[PDB]
Amino acid sequence: PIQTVGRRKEAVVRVRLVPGTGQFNLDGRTLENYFPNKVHQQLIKAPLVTVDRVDQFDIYAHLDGGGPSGQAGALRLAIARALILVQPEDRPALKKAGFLTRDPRAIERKKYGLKKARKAPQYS
Amino acid sequence: PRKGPAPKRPLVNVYGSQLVTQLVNKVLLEGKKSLAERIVYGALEQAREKTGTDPVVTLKRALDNVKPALEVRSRRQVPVEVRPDRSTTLALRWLVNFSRQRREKTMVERLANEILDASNGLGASVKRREDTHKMAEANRAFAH
Amino acid sequence: SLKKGPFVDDHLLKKVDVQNEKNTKQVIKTWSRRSTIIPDFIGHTFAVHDGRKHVPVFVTEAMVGHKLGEFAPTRTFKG
Amino acid sequence: ARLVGVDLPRDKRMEIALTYIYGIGRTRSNEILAATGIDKNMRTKDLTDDQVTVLRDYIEGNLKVEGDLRREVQADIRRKIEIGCYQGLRHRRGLPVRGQRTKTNARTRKGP
Amino acid sequence: AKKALVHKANKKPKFAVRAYTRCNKCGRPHSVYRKFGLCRICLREMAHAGELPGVQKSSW
Amino acid sequence: QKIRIRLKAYDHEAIDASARKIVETVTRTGASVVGPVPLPTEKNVYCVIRPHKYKDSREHFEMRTHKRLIDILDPTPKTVDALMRIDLPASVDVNIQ
Amino acid sequence: GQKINPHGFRLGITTEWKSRWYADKQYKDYVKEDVAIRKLLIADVEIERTRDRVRVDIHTARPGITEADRIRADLEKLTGKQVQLNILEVKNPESQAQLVAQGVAEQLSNRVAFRRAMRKAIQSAMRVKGIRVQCSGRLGGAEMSRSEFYREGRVPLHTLRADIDYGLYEAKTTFGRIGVKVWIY
RNA sequence: ACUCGUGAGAGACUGCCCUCGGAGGAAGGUGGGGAUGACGUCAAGUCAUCAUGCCCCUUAUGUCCAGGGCUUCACACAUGCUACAAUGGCCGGUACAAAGGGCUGCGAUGCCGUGAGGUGGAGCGAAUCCUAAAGCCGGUCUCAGUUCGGAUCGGGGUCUGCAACUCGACCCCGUGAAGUCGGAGUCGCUAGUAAUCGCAGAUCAGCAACGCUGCGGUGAAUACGUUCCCG
RNA sequence: CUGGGUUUGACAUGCAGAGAUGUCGCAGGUGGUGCAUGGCUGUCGUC
Ligand SMILES: [Mg+2]
Ligand SMILES: [Mg+2]
Ligand SMILES: [Mg+2]
Ligand SMILES: [Mg+2]
Ligand SMILES: [Mg+2]
Ligand SMILES: [Mg+2]
Ligand SMILES: [Mg+2]
Ligand SMILES: [Mg+2]
Ligand SMILES: [Mg+2]
């Protein structure tokens, strides 16, 4: 089958596609119950809704690492890769929409002399 | 900033309006979006129900009555033509600050009532744009 | 707060056991600051070390729960 | 509405109403109103006069409501001050008692 | 830190508390790493000189 | 009837010498074993000030203990004699289990 | 501060521990054991500890200085383990880093002047891609200290691939001590 | 198989239209951060990490031991936590981290207790065993020095330790002090950064730790510009 | 710092008492001088 990675901010996702009616499940739970949030709802479905496939595919998914905004954003890139393995007609749409980029955003190291990463202490 | 302009941040639009996501961030403190957003959805959909009877344009028409076209600066006071996008930053940011100043119990209600006063033009947010235009256009001499 | 039991240092309490024979007499030198006042002691003197000199300390029934070191203040501020 | 001690809170919930009494704070008021008893969301106005006297009789005997309690804290200090314990050497010159550093910021005891 | 107070740390302490752990080479009380059993300063003499196996700079 | 050869050592290249040396000794008696399997590397970290009065300066000092697990499936009297005897790793720990 | 130890700086790439033994529970003790040995006991000294066994390998320019078998028995008491001692030679003690510093240590201690004594080391050892040598502090019994250096060829300190052999010794005069430093690429 | 741990590798150089923009690629034209500190300044810090020239102490300024003291206190400055409230407090539900540490050690279920704890020892020298909060849905308080705040003080306790009076902190109960965004003036920060929220470690019986050094959660605002000050 | 002991000095070449300690079963010195010095850092400046 189609099995696809996705990562964000150290939040390691799995995805797998089967064709069927419009739902998807997250370790034996609904989308609405895992993310009670309107912002994270559209952001997962963005590669589905932009291309207008939407109700074609199931997703079963496993969720490790990170947090709610990390794992929600990680599903987007997981799906964005996965819809190309259906057919590479979607790739030129999905690239210009801007979903195939993972974030090279990651948390910077806390440095000696400084309390958070960049932030120095008080002076003189 | 000395060497050249850095690139501006991209900004994602349930409503699908540029202004509401810009309002979310101006409301936001402590870096938590959800309590910032639920106060916006509290105030915006209160103004939907009671008075104005559409969601977005009640804010957008009120936002025109905050927006200044002109601002004052000191060279060391020279008035300056404000950019199209900088006018919207002052529009949101004033509207949020006077909601924090207001006496009403909760910011669902304070931010709601501020938008209604901005629709009329009796509010403290709309009071400020007159004062900036007063201080701008009373000068003019210094502009060269 | 010694959870279970009180503390007296064993060299102190032997001198108090000698006073039982006399029923307590005079003032006995004491270099252990660290001992409790067990109600065997009540109505007795001892000369307790200040880290400098020995201060005379009479005992009463009010001073039972308190430790022996509490009645000789080690540093002086008049000003 | 007497409150037993004397003062009557000006209405509101009952759970917190008892904290204005000197003997009682939050946890002992939870213990009273559980046993005696009447719910937390009941208010001080909507108690009947005999329902106040059920609170009176139970806690009057058990704890120090005010004056008895008020004198006992002062009377323990009065002996301890002259008791000769170092702990009440510190009372006689208005300094902190429980082994704090008095070099910077002991302004609760000392004052402005 | 002297010679005499070093041999205090080697002796039997009488009570199990008083064993306070001097540095082996440094003979310094403060900042002696457990396991290494070395002075913090001494650690930099040893670790730069390639003396402690498995210990090396650094970040990251 | 399963023997487990646990390795621990500092240098990651030096274990790759020994991990081959376990294979050749056991594959004399022929086949069997899992092969080597990577296993995660621990990291103790120690921050030290660079003699007196300059706190902001600092170094850091890692030490890495690389580990291998191996797992021999087949015990045999010919194997266990040859396993310990001819195999000699230099400055690397081996714990049979 | 200025110039980290280039021996320690290239530990991952090309330096290799003088002590090459592993432990966990015995690890505090084996460091304390090696501190006793290197105080007691020269170009370089390596050790390869194993249970009940130590190599204690030595590099020296003049190997001959029977007596080593007594020094084994001196180390035998402190270690309490089977000492299998080896003394080795090294090719080019002229080119070795600590032995150049020990060469200059003899010169300054015997009241040879420093600009004479330094020039020998840089000229001879180059006769390697480049050399830098530096003697520091209290030179010829002057009141104020100074540090001067000499060099020939090229010595790139920041290049990690470049193997620099570093050495140090405190040569002890009538007036104090001079710290010699030798970088050889 | 998909992760994930390592071990080999490939992949970015304006290379295809100064620079504006192109096509892919996971990535752009210093991709992100560290490690690195030239020749030298300041007679910059340390004789208290350790060495050491000279001078001094040698019958003590050396050397054990209990005792105190380094924790005082009219004040003054500095660095930092907790706060001044509804983007809240209390309280019931329900859930997402990755770095770590563990042999005189880390300590599970179980029963005792209001609780810090006691009891007892499963398992374990380790990807096996032991070790999130803010959030979201509800409820409740109503702009009050309060159900904000958690200082100070009085009784009692637990735990290591020979011993917690001088001086350990832990949590139960009474008390509820100043404080209503802060004068002149001042610093920190250009993106996973500021701001906020936890978790672990080193030293360590015990802990004055709100410090220090690391990790991950949520996550903004603005950089028109170079005259204006500072280097 | 007040004491209680000790003298080539702790290092190399059970009953008494606060307790160390009893009585029976040349070394050394956190000691002066960082403007005598080495080594090791801070800094101007990652300029
Ligand atoms: Mg952070
Ligand atoms: Mg470079
Ligand atoms: Mg000076
Ligand atoms: Mg201090
Ligand atoms: Mg004073
Ligand atoms: Mg809760
Ligand atoms: Mg601790
Ligand atoms: Mg000296
Ligand atoms: Mg100097």
Side-chain angles (χ1 to χ4, degrees), chain A, chain B, chain C, chain D residues 1 5 9 13-112, chain E, chain F, chain G:
Chain A
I2 298 159
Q3 278 186 339
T4 316
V5 196
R7 291 188 199 75
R8 190 188 151 87
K9 204 150 53 156
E10 305 191 341
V12 181
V13 178
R14 298 167 192 74
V15 167
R16 47 153 173 168
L17 302 173
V18 189
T21 52
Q23 79 292 336
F24 48 95
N25 300 318
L26 306 177
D27 299 284
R29 199 189 294 175
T30 53
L31 181 276
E32 68 202 317
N33 194 36
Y34 198 92
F35 302 121
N37 207 328
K38 297 184 169 289
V39 175
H40 301 314
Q41 188 172 353
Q42 63 155 16
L43 196 65
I44 299 156
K45 299 182 168 170
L48 299 165
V49 174
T50 51
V51 183
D52 307 283
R53 316 296 288 284
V54 183
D55 300 304
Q56 288 197 333
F57 302 113
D58 303 314
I59 300 158
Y60 302 88
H62 304 281
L63 302 175
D64 294 301
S69 190
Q71 290 180 338
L75 275 165
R76 189 187 76 178
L77 193 133
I79 296 155
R81 287 187 197 172
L83 298 176
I84 299 157
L85 292 167
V86 171
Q87 203 178 353
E89 290 190 328
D90 301 335
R91 175 166 280 177
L94 289 163
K95 194 188 149 53
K96 294 181 179 177
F99 299 118
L100 303 177
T101 51
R102 201 186 158 282
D103 304 83
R105 298 170 181 179
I107 293 159
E108 297 191 334
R109 179 159 87 73
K110 192 219 165 278
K111 299 158 205 182
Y112 54 76
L114 310 176
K115 294 176 180 145
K116 305 172 194 163
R118 307 287 266 286
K119 179 165 87 77
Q122 293 285 315
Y123 181 102
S124 203
Chain B
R2 177 162 265 173
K3 178 54 174 66
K8 197 178 277 169
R9 293 279 177 284
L11 185 134
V12 179
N13 261 332
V14 51
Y15 280 62
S17 74
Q18 293 282 318
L19 296 169
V20 174
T21 312
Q22 289 180 2
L23 175 62
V24 165
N25 299 321
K26 295 288 198 305
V27 170
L28 179 149
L29 57 86
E30 215 174 16
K32 38 170 77 188
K33 196 182 286 301
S34 184
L35 268 156
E37 194 174 41
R38 285 201 300 99
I39 295 164
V40 172
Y41 292 164
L44 184 52
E45 303 191 309
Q46 182 165 22
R48 191 174 183 176
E49 281 181 306
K50 270 64 180 172
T51 55
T53 205
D54 286 298
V56 180
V57 181
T58 49
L59 195 135
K60 194 181 280 184
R61 194 176 67 76
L63 190 133
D64 290 18
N65 301 346
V66 191
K67 275 171 72 172
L70 295 168
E71 280 285 297
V72 182
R73 289 169 55 76
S74 56
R75 196 190 157 285
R76 201 187 287 177
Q77 285 193 322
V78 179
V80 178
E81 182 59 51
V82 178
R83 292 174 65 76
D85 199 64
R86 191 167 189 285
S87 192
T88 59
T89 60
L90 294 160
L92 278 311
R93 195 177 82 233
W94 294 349
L95 195 138
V96 174
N97 289 334
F98 292 117
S99 82
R100 295 168 192 185
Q101 200 173 326
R102 197 164 283 200
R103 305 292 185 76
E104 190 61 53
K105 66 179 185 68
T106 56
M107 197 156 280
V108 169
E109 303 194 333
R110 287 178 280 177
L111 197 134
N113 295 338
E114 178 55 61
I115 297 157
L116 303 188
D117 294 318
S119 302
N120 298 330
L122 299 167
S125 190
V126 182
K127 195 173 278 179
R128 198 183 268 287
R129 74 158 286 284
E130 292 188 311
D131 294 316
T132 55
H133 284 305
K134 182 173 160 66
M135 290 170 69
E137 292 284 297
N139 294 339
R140 302 296 303 280
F142 298 128
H144 52 85
Chain C
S1 54
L2 187 73
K3 30 166 199 181
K4 294 154 67 172
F7 185 75
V8 175
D9 202 342
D10 70 316
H11 59 77
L12 192 148
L13 193 132
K14 187 164 176 177
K15 292 191 287 295
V16 177
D17 290 12
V18 172
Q19 297 298 334
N20 162 20
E21 169 173 340
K22 332 288 280 194
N23 307 41
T24 290
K25 69 139 208 167
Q26 100 256 268
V27 203
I28 35 60
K29 284 193 62 55
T30 303
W31 269 298
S32 48
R33 195 171 270 274
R34 311 181 277 95
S35 301
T36 59
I37 294 158
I38 298 174
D40 289 296
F41 292 3
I42 300 160
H44 189 46
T45 50
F46 28 64
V48 187
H49 198 44
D50 208 68
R52 178 169 181 76
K53 61 194 178 291
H54 291 267
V55 179
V57 176
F58 194 83
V59 181
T60 58
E61 196 165 51
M63 308 187 214
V64 170
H66 297 298
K67 204 165 274 281
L68 190 135
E70 294 181 50
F71 315 95
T74 51
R75 57 175 85 78
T76 56
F77 183 80
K78 293 190 177 291
Chain D
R13 284 177 57 189
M14 271 297 297
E15 198 192 323
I16 202 69
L18 298 165
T19 63
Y20 291 96
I21 298 156
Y22 187 81
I24 303 158
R26 190 163 289 190
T27 50
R28 292 179 90 73
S29 62
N30 292 327
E31 195 264 294
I32 290 153
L33 299 179
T36 302
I38 188 65
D39 293 300
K40 298 161 171 185
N41 300 322
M42 188 65 79
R43 300 183 174 284
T44 57
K45 293 172 187 177
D46 301 308
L47 300 181
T48 60
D49 197 65
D50 292 297
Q51 192 172 13
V52 173
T53 60
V54 191
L55 298 164
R56 287 180 70 84
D57 196 62
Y58 170 44
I59 83 79
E60 209 186 66
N62 191 14
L63 42 171
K64 315 73 195 178
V65 184
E66 166 58 57
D68 37 14
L69 191 63
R70 191 157 303 278
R71 73 179 67 188
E72 277 171 23
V73 176
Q74 183 57 246
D76 212 320
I77 295 156
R78 278 179 74 75
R79 70 185 177 77
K80 192 163 73 172
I81 314 175
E82 303 197 330
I83 306 179
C85 57
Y86 151 80
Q87 199 170 20
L89 271 165
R90 301 285 266 196
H91 277 291
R92 286 186 273 187
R93 61 182 59 75
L95 283 171
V97 178
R98 305 186 161 180
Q100 295 166 24
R101 290 186 179 76
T102 71
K103 192 174 181 169
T104 58
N105 300 108
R107 297 292 206 172
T108 308
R109 297 292 302 169
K110 298 172 79 76
Chain E
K2 310 189 169 171
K3 297 290 190 187
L5 305 175
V6 174
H7 204 283
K8 285 188 173 187
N10 297 325
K11 277 177 176 179
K12 292 289 288 186
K14 206 166 71 171
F15 306 98
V17 174
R18 290 183 180 181
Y20 71 91
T21 75
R22 282 282 171 83
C23 188
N24 292 313
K25 178 183 183 62
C26 307
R28 202 201 178 205
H30 286 286
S31 76
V32 180
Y33 286 79
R34 200 168 277 168
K35 155 195 195 72
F36 286 125
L38 226 320
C39 320
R40 82 171 172 66
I41 314 170
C42 297
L43 204 184
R44 295 182 77 262
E45 292 168 29
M46 300 299 93
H48 289 316
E51 215 78 9
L52 315 175
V55 175
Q56 62 135 344
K57 292 191 53 44
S58 71
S59 79
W60 194 247
Chain F
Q1 296 188 319
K2 282 195 291 193
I3 301 157
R4 179 175 289 167
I5 305 183
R6 198 174 165 76
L7 269 66
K8 301 182 191 159
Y10 295 124
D11 190 53
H12 65 266
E13 296 192 311
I15 295 169
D16 290 27
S18 68
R20 292 169 182 180
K21 204 184 281 185
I22 288 111
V23 170
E24 71 184 7
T25 312
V26 179
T27 59
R28 176 53 59 78
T29 59
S32 88
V33 209
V34 175
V37 64
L39 206 67
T41 311
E42 299 188 303
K43 279 191 287 299
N44 301 357
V45 181
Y46 300 105
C47 316
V48 289
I49 299 156
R50 300 195 188 200
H52 127 311
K53 90 105 72 161
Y54 289 112
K55 197 76 160 299
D56 297 22
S57 56
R58 311 313 198 86
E59 288 197 293
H60 300 274
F61 282 98
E62 296 174 29
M63 55 187 289
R64 300 186 171 180
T65 55
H66 301 93
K67 302 181 282 192
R68 305 290 159 76
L69 175 278
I70 293 168
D71 251 314
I72 288 168
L73 301 174
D74 190 55
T76 318
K78 293 181 177 179
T79 302
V80 72
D81 190 58
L83 185 143
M84 197 175 287
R85 181 164 175 181
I86 203 75
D87 196 75
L88 289 171
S91 84
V92 174
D93 186 59
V94 179
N95 297 329
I96 65 175
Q97 289 177 308
Chain G
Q2 308 190 326
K3 305 190 285 187
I4 194 162
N5 196 336
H7 190 270
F9 186 51
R10 303 171 176 75
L11 269 172
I13 302 154
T14 43
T15 300
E16 75 251 28
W17 296 259
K18 303 317 152 195
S19 287
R20 37 176 288 185
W21 49 253
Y22 172 86
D24 296 305
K25 199 180 287 304
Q26 306 289 76
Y27 186 82
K28 192 164 66 58
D29 295 302
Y30 295 154
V31 173
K32 189 169 64 53
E33 198 170 294
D34 290 19
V35 171
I37 296 160
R38 289 163 188 282
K39 192 187 288 302
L40 185 143
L41 200 134
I42 298 161
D44 193 54
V45 176
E46 300 191 315
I47 306 176
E48 168 185 336
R49 171 181 293 81
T50 311
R51 76 183 299 149
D52 324 23
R53 201 176 291 181
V54 288
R55 290 278 164 284
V56 199
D57 299 312
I58 302 166
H59 301 79
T60 309
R62 44 163 81 180
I65 309 306
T66 56
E67 184 59 52
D69 294 297
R70 289 188 168 179
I71 295 156
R72 280 193 208 189
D74 197 6
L75 296 171
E76 186 66 49
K77 191 163 178 181
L78 298 172
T79 56
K81 285 193 189 302
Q82 194 189 311
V83 180
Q84 293 193 333
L85 186 57
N86 303 311
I87 300 93
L88 303 169
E89 289 192 301
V90 279
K91 298 186 287 299
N92 307 290
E94 198 182 66
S95 191
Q96 189 65 51
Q98 294 204 336
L99 300 175
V100 172
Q102 289 279 78
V104 176
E106 293 286 298
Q107 296 287 302
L108 294 162
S109 59
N110 297 317
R111 309 193 292 283
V112 185
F114 63 88
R115 296 197 278 279
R116 195 191 176 77
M118 291 270 286
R119 277 189 182 181
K120 290 181 186 178
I122 297 101
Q123 195 185 346
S124 66
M126 190 69 199
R127 186 176 55 75
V128 298
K129 201 151 177 277
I131 293 153
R132 188 198 168 84
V133 186
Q134 183 183 340
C135 54
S136 301
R138 181 53 67 119
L139 300 172
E143 187 62 51
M144 295 176 268
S145 62
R146 61 185 181 284
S147 54
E148 296 185 306
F149 66 93
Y150 290 119
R151 51 165 305 166
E152 196 174 304
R154 63 188 306 285
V155 182
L157 266 75
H158 296 242
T159 54
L160 285 156
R161 64 159 76 76
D163 290 303
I164 302 163
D165 302 333
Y166 182 68
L168 190 138
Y169 188 81
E170 302 189 343
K172 44 174 181 295
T173 63
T174 53
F175 294 97
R177 286 195 169 192
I178 298 157
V180 183
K181 293 187 175 164
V182 181
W183 298 269
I184 300 164
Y185 172 45

